[PDB]
Write a protein that binds this ligand. Structure first.
Ligand SMILES: *[C@@H]1O[C@H](CO)[C@@H](O[C@@H]2O[C@H](CO)[C@@H](O)[C@H](O)[C@H]2NC(C)=O)[C@H](O)[C@H]1NC(C)=O
Ligand SMILES: [Zn+2]
Ligand SMILES: [Zn+2]
Ligand SMILES: [Zn+2]
Ligand SMILES: [Zn+2]
Ligand SMILES: [Zn+2]
Ligand SMILES: [Zn+2]
Length: 276
């Protein structure tokens, strides 16, 4: 019973209706301000890698809040240390977009919004057994933020949707909550190859939907990948759930939180990584 577009249940009210932890002071998203961040040269190239023995199918769903891809377990992994040892396991990827092309992202970079931001959501497997072990425990989750930029005269194999395999055509008016659906696997490593994975912001924050748990190690890449107007619009075709005042899914993004609200009891820092 939280929403984006229903003013009685909308984001301004989350800190009240879900105090744990939407009222905390390590919230996301934030404005990633290049000039107010500490470069940390010890932060390494992000690697995404697959368990090739995994053969289980990949699905997608309209959950009422986003278009969410649910990946099978033991399939997709993140490494932040160059070691391929299954420390972080990808669970799910979802998206945040606007009603118009000029907004939709949750994070901004130096004040700039983007039309679409994806989240690849993983659990700290080195510490926790399963996704549901992780989701509510401290230091449980690591999420990647991927910016998308709208481009016009471009070949399809150079857009993100190639990596998404175009969501196996599943995106349309018909796709309704909570109807799941089978698709071909997203090539996440290809997706990553389309930006620069040594260049990102890094900080401790939260889930950007209630209950806003403060257990996300955030990584947001600096360089956007590319989409067409045709491509973005397939998103706006999905219907929202019953809880929303708007009909067509959009503006499903949370307003900007402060890095350090004045009532914080231990400030946090925004870090930034760069190549070689
Ligand atoms: C890679 O995937 C394989 C196959 O999906 C995983 O092995 C299976 O899952 C568990 C082992 O933990 C057992 O129930 C089965 O004996 C295995 N079955 C198959 C199909 O081989 C494997 O553990 C995965 N590896 C990682 C690191 O996640
Ligand atoms: Zn809900
Ligand atoms: Zn209040
Ligand atoms: Zn600068
Ligand atoms: Zn829900
Ligand atoms: Zn998200
Ligand atoms: Zn065109």
């Amino acid at each position: 019973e939280w929403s984006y577009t229903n003013i009685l249940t909308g984001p301004e009210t989350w800190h009240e209706h879900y105090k744990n932890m939407c009222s905390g002071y390590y919230q996301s998203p934030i404005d990633l301000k290049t000039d107010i961040s500490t470069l940390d040269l010890k932060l390494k190239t992000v690697i995404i890698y697959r368990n090739t023995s995994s053969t289980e199918t990949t699905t997608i769903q309209n959950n009422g809040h986003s278009a969410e891809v649910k990946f099978p377990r033991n399939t997709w992994f993140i490494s932040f240390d160059g070691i391929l040892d299954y420390k972080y396991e990808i669970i799910q990827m979802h998206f945040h977009w606007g009603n118009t092309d000029d907004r939709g992202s949750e994070h901004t970079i130096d004040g700039f919004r983007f039309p679409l931001e994806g989240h690849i959501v993983s659990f700290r497997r080195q510490m926790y057994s399963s996704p549901s072990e992780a989701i509510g425990r401290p230091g449980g989750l690591a999420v990647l933020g991927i910016m998308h930029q709208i481009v016009e005269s471009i070949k399809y194999e150079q857009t993100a949707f190639k990596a998404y395999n175009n969501f196996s055509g599943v995106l349309n008016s018909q796709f309704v909550p909570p109807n799941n659906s089978t698709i071909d696997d997203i090539n996440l490593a290809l997706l990553l190859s389309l930006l620069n994975p040594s260049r990102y912001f890094r900080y401790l924050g939260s889930l950007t939907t209630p209950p806003c748990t403060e257990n996300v190690l955030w990584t947001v890449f600096i360089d956007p990948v590319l989409i067409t107007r045709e491509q973005i619009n397939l998103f706006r075709n999905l219907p929202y759930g019953s809880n929303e005042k708007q009909t067509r899914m959009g503006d499903n993004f949370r307003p900007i939180q402060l890095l350090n609200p004045i009532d914080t009891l231990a400030s946090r820092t925004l870090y930034r990584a760069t190549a070689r």
